[PDB]
Design an enzyme around this catalytic site. Sequence first.
Site, short mmCIF file in Angstrom:
data_model
loop_
_atom_site.label_atom_id
_atom_site.label_comp_id
_atom_site.label_asym_id
_atom_site.label_seq_id
_atom_site.Cartn_x
_atom_site.Cartn_y
_atom_site.Cartn_z
N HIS A 1 0.93 -1.38 0.03
CA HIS A 1 -0.02 -0.02 -0.19
C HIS A 1 0.73 1.16 0.17
O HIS A 1 1.55 1.43 1.05
CB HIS A 1 -1.01 0.02 1.04
CG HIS A 1 -1.60 -1.23 1.70
ND1 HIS A 1 -2.60 -1.87 0.72
CD2 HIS A 1 -1.32 -2.14 2.25
CE1 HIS A 1 -3.36 -2.76 1.04
NE2 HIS A 1 -2.33 -3.21 2.18
N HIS A 2 0.63 2.01 -0.97
CA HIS A 2 1.73 3.45 -1.40
C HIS A 2 0.62 4.42 -1.01
O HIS A 2 -0.17 4.65 -1.80
CB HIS A 2 2.07 3.21 -2.69
CG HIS A 2 2.87 4.58 -3.04
ND1 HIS A 2 3.93 4.91 -2.38
CD2 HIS A 2 2.65 5.32 -4.01
CE1 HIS A 2 4.47 6.27 -2.87
NE2 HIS A 2 3.61 6.51 -3.87
#
Lengths: 146, 146
Positions: free
Chosen positions: B80-81
Amino acid sequence: GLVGKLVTQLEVNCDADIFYKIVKHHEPNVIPHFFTGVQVTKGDGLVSGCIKEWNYVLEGKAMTAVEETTHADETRTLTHHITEGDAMKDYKKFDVIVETNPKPNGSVVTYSIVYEKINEDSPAPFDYLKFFHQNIVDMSAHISSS
Amino acid sequence: GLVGKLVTQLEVNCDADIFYKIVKHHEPNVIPHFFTGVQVTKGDGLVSGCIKEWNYVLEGKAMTAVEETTHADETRTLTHHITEGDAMKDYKKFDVIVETNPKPNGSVVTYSIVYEKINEDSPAPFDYLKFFHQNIVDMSAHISSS
């Protein structure tokens, strides 16, 4: 989820071997604490570790712990093995491992808390992780180049 | 200490590949939250990830985040960025990496938060680490054998 590990990892601008020797011979005076205890030798007369009974205040609450510390110079690793105290009301096992390594690039410092809870109602040791984190940040801010 | 990583690692009684497929397609309804967003495809028409804007309540405070999620089936890793939101008031970079592997022995699940603070006055993301930890403990308690 009874067995687990919490980790805080920090980059520090300092050679790994020097930083490890600093950590190995240092403790956060702001924090109420003291210890009593003994030095341990390997048998040739030179200290290989220590056994300490700590009295300390964590998040406002007074606590005690008995820890055995050992070190490994070749891997720049300190190991604190807790055998007794308030933490053992929550954990069957509570070990704190401190490693310092050079960046592939200064250094990377890793605090790991390896734990096994007594039961599912036990917390994970986020209070200790934050404590160790802020202590090593504080010590790192008082170290500087040259 | 501006660059760092926080990790919570948990053992789960479940095959790694199955657990990863569960994590990959699941979220904690008790916690106020919702998202809007889109699916991302690699170009053959099958989803490779998603981009979501989250609205959530963390330790009582309402927050937003935009995250891009990608996955790697071969290493059972979700990434998850985070690009925007309340967390970016404290961090230049905030990435959350979820890995599931079999025990050398069920499985070991690893949440890592890879972060860079804006400045020295920024906190480390202990609030997010505890949040992700309790969420994966909750989801793991609703899964069982057979």
